């Protein structure tokens with residue numbers, strides 16, 4: 734179907750936090766795009782709020798470009814550049830196993846994405862594999878952060894921080910602690926509180942038991958995040974340096990060759 738004079742709406746590929754995702758084509762520029770549809774009459778409209786967040790975050794590395802914003806028939810329409818698969822899709826495609834090199838290359842970029850969002854006075858609140866996409870073509874080495882539907886100016890139970898389970902207001906430390914669980918999830922293939930209550934299991938699982946058999950940096954990362962105060966500005970540089978020093982000790986080259994590039 735025709736959308737905003739130049740876009741052609743394609744098939745539904747999935748969903749966001751508050752709307753359906755579709756594939757699409759920018760007919761004028763000759764480029765494939767991603768289209769997010771809301772519902773004009775929705776009780777809690779949020780698509781234009783999210784567009785404002787994306788607009789404010791433009792210019793930042795790994796922040797997707799929003800091409801158009803409007804309303805077509807029954808829906809509010811946001812048009813974004815086409816990005817690649819999610820880290821969740823890539824993990825499943827890689828048989829739910831990532832090499833240490835891949836986990837570290839992902840960690841370096843993911844910490845930077847979270848830090849940029851925080852530098853722009855926002856917390857993400859839903860740091861999970863599904864919310865990170867690899868770019869396509871020339872941007873195939875780039876980790877993009879998506880979905881600002883749950884974002885707030887300063888989530889998923891599997892990756893939620895202990896503070897979140899306790900019902901505490903989310904802050905900068907919570908986005909980073911969630912990233913720590915995502916990194917361990919990539920190392921193990923699953924988390925001990927997956928497919929189980931989750932709060933009880935997370936609190937009864939010492940960081941050292943969770944990270945057993947894996948480099949100490951993953952535990953040090955989670956311990957640092959769990960030690961941060963509510964209003965604390967996290968030391969993002971320290972956390973990246975933690976994984977960067979391990980990357981160098983392992984003798985890996987920062988060449989952006991991920992496990993999926995080997996298929």
Ligand SMILES: Cn1cc(-c2ccnc3c2OCCNC3)c(-c2ccc(F)cc2)n1
Nearest residue numbers: 748749767768769811812813815816817818
């Ligand atoms: C959950 N989700 C995922 C994509 C997504 C974005 C870009 N490209 C793709 C996306 O889906 C993954 C698969 N690759 C194709 C969005 C999205 C967001 C805003 C928008 F306006 C449009 C889409 N949301």
